[PDB]
Amino acid sequence: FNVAHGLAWSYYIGYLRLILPELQARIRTYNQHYNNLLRGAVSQRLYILLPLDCGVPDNLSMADPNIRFLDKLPQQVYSNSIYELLENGQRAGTCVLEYATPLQTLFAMSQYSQAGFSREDRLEQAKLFCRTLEDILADAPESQNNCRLIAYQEPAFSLSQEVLRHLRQEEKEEVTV
Amino acid sequence: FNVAHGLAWSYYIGYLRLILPELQARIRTYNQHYNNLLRGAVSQRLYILLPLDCGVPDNLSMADPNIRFLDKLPQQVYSNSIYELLENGQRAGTCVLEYATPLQTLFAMSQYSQAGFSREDRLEQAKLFCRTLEDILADAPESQNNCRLIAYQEPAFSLSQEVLRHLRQEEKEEVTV
Ligand SMILES: CCn1nc(C)cc1C(=O)Nc1nc2cc(C(N)=O)ccc2n1C[C@H](O)c1ccccc1
């Protein structure tokens, strides 16, 4: 009994597979502007946050003030937000960012006593969710190239630094190959 | 590996548990009107259609012309539609009706070759989805009393007659106990 299997297939089949094909185009179009204006550039991939603690806030800035809302991404109806990642008050990167909503279900199940679903169970299923979604995106046409999973366990931490590490690695890969 | 487990928990935790508490109130309020006007009454439970063939049309009338859109249910934002069930052109019942959207995921997976998910698999998981959702609603507070699952296999059929059978049984139970 692994709720993560169905959660990952539902998230892919019912959302990612539908939104991702439009995204590269929406982002390029925006980047004409962003460039001419702030000489900036938004990464072309959807960055999906996968906190293993299944903590999804209503606004990213609350999880880290160095993650600042910049703009809504226009449509070519799906709402997607571009954020700037700050270091010492300076813009260090920009990207389309959002949390994987299925993790909220895992959180809610761990607080729903009738489910018999412990915090240990929640963590196990959050990891399984990440692995399954990775497997799906690996076999998937282009979708894998249109997004990046950012999974992290917080100790008992800077989310903006984690995202910047990925953005910088993404650029490195782009220019070296 | 059973995607139905996660589909059913996600459908409950992320939708049914959230909508059902408002529903009895929305329906009672509407029924003041419906009564004073057409001397009719809308059943107080959400009827969820669970076709085991995972065929979900964009409009109910296409699955059966004796299922006719009547009105949108007002809010106390969730969109819910009241339908009239016809027999020989006459109104025989009314209820809030909708398909269980997770079955669409099962359908899409059966057409997504990379999933390795056959029609046999789809049927097996559609049944498991129904059973799991029933189990969840059975342990759930009031939610079980605020909705009714209508699961059916179509041969190789009148959907309105299936729904009316349930509505009439529901009334019988109400008046006898
Ligand atoms: C069903 C897919 N899924 N499975 C799991 C598990 C988690 C998700 C998921 O995350 N879904 C989802 N993400 C969305 C993002 C936006 C946006 N970015 O504006 C808008 C709607 C979004 N939906 C909802 C979807 O369209 C829908 C389904 C049924 C009925 C109405 C709507």
Ligand SMILES: CCn1nc(C)cc1C(=O)Nc1nc2cc(C(N)=O)ccc2n1C[C@H](O)c1ccccc1
């Ligand atoms: C996530 C829950 N789920 N799991 C499976 C599996 C199927 C469903 C499902 O059916 N979901 C759903 N049913 C909806 C009905 C209405 C209406 N009747 O207006 C509006 C939104 C509705 N959603 C979407 C939900 O709000 C949402 C999730 C993530 C992001 C944005 C929205």
Ligand SMILES: [Ca+2]
């Ligand atoms: Ca956290």
Ligand SMILES: [Ca+2]
């Ligand atoms: Ca059918």
